[PDB]
């Protein structure tokens, strides 16, 4: 794998007002793991699902607040949201980052665009209770 580096001495916002939102299909679990890739094979997807209208600069934090509106039990402080992108190679996975509710974390401002999300991909969220 070739590698690129740059002098560290930026990313830009979407004008959401002038841009049609994309349709994100979001799948979720509460068993402690992501959906398996066999669950996306042969033209099938997982039954646990949410639709989110958003933009390429959606952040994990923004996405976590939408999930919380819909799963009231995800509300509790310390609840863990682990995010993955599911993408056509059949499908594959790549964990991208995590958040938790009521807490600031280092991945909170990570955006779909920074992770090379391409439209057509799915988002998978493994949800776990507070420590």
Curated annotation (Swiss-Prot):
Q: Name one GO biological process term.
A: negative regulation of mRNA splicing, via spliceosome
Q: Which residues form a coiled coil?
A: none
Q: Which domain of life is it from?
A: Eukaryota
> Which key words are in the record?
Acetylation, Cytoplasm, Isopeptide bond, mRNA processing, mRNA splicing, Nucleus, Repressor, Transcription, Transcription regulation, Ubl conjugation
Q: Where in the cell is it found?
A: Nucleus; Cytoplasm; Nucleus speckle
Pfam families linked to this entry: SAP18 (PF06487)
Q: What does UniProt give as GO cellular component?
A: ASAP complex; cytoplasm; histone deacetylase complex; nuclear speck; nucleoplasm; transcription regulator complex
Gene Ontology molecular function terms on file: transcription corepressor activity
Task of the protein = Component of the SIN3-repressing complex. Enhances the ability of SIN3-HDAC1-mediated transcriptional repression. When tethered to the promoter, it can direct the formation of a repressive complex to core histone proteins. Auxiliary component of the splicing-dependent multiprotein exon junction complex (EJC) deposited at splice junction on mRNAs. The EJC is a dynamic structure consisting of core proteins and several peripheral nuclear and cytoplasmic associated factors that join the complex only transiently either during EJC assembly or during subsequent mRNA metabolism.
Subunit relationships = Found in a mRNA splicing-dependent exon junction complex (EJC). Component of the heterotrimeric ASAP (apoptosis- and splicing-associated protein) and PSAP complexes consisting of RNPS1, SAP18 and either ACIN1 or PNN, respectively; the ASAP and PSAP complexes probably are formed mutually exclusive. For the ASAP complex, the association of SAP18 seems to require a preformed RNPS1:ACIN1 complex. Forms a complex with SIN3A and HDAC1. Interacts with SUFU.
Q: What family is this?
A: Belongs to the SAP18 family.
Protein known as: Histone deacetylase complex subunit SAP18
Q: What organism is this sequence from?
A: Mus musculus
